[PDB]
Amino acid sequence: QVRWKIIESYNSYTFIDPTQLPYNEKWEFPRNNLQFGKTLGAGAFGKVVEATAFGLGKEDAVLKVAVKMLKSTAHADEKEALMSELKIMSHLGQHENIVNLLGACTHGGPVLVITEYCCYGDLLNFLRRKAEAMLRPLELRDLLHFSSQVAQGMAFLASKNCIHRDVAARNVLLTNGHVAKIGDFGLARDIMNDSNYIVKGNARLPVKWMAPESIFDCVYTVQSDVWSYGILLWEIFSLGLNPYPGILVNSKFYKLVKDGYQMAQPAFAPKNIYSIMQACWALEPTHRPTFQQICSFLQEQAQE
Numbered sequence: 001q002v003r004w005k006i007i008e009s010y011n012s013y014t015f016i017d018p019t020q021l022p023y024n025e026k027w028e029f030p031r032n033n034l035q036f037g038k039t040l041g042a043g044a045f046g047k048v049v050e051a052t053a054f055g056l057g058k059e060d061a062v063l064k065v066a067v068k069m070l071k072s073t074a075h076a077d078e079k080e081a082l083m084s085e086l087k088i089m090s091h092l093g094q095h096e097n098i099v100n101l102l103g104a105c106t107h108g109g110p111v112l113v114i115t116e117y118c119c120y121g122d123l124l125n126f127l128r129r130k131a132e133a134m135l136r137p138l139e140l141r142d143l144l145h146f147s148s149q150v151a152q153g154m155a156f157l158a159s160k161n162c163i164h165r166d167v168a169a170r171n172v173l174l175t176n177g178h179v180a181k182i183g184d185f186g187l188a189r190d191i192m193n194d195s196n197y198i199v200k201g202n203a204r205l206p207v208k209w210m211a212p213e214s215i216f217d218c219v220y221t222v223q224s225d226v227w228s229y230g231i232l233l234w235e236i237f238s239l240g241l242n243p244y245p246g247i248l249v250n251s252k253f254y255k256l257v258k259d260g261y262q263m264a265q266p267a268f269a270p271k272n273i274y275s276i277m278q279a280c281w282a283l284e285p286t287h288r289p290t291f292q293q294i295c296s297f298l299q300e301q302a303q304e
């Protein structure tokens, strides 16, 4: 899967599985107070559309928001998956580096999940456009900020025993001040038409971002998200190159990663940042750093 999930842990303790419980009606917002605009993206069974929400929250704000909803192809299972994502977001609480839940419309029509709108789009496209500019250029401080902001969002999910399962620059969004935010985009992102999601039976998996234990054993842990985060750092510090450049996803690829092959240091990564990627890429999951350890070390690189 490529959706967020709450797991059990015996640091942080899982008392409840929010997906297995009813929805908290405190998030209910009137659907007629939404004015829809353009579609931001769509998956096989869901889509995300920009909207203006009129009188949303404590401050009765009028703001641009992102609204998730089902497509015509969706049945009971897809409706459950959207409700499940809504239940997870209501449980986790707010964080500055997460695409926060703002409201929901679960009555009087199709289910709508209202979240923060990220005005600058995805990080991957942003890096690519900045890298190719003919002419404010990116600085190392900007790249360190993106890296730190994602690590803080990931340390927040880990503290809540929540696994991400699709860490990648395409899944990092940039909001006001070019601040990075992560979110669960599995239901609304275009997986079917993106060749980075490899056909593996009935699943489509982002194989170049996955930890060896995830591709081979279907094991997903906070440590497997750490591996993907190392791939994301490589994307940030190469300014958006495709991982394992020019290497096709086939049997030789799986053999290379199984055998400990690692991508070369990217062009804009200082040696200390490359050392974080190498640590994320330890074959033994317990030898990888935690997201809190990454946050602490990134803070040292920003200061010095």
Ligand SMILES: COc1ccc(Nc2ncc3c(n2)n([C@H]2CC[C@H](O)CC2)c(=O)n3C)c(C)c1
Pocket (backbone or CB within 6 Å): 040, 041, 042, 048, 066, 068, 099, 115, 116, 117, 118, 119, 120, 121, 122, 170, 171, 173, 183, 184, 185, 188, 189, 190
């Ligand atoms: C390409 O142009 C882009 C991309 C993203 C945004 N902003 C954005 N804000 C909030 C979002 C969001 N997108 N999405 C998806 C959209 C498809 C994308 O592939 C993944 C993220 C969400 O699910 N929420 C909650 C914009 C304004 C332009």
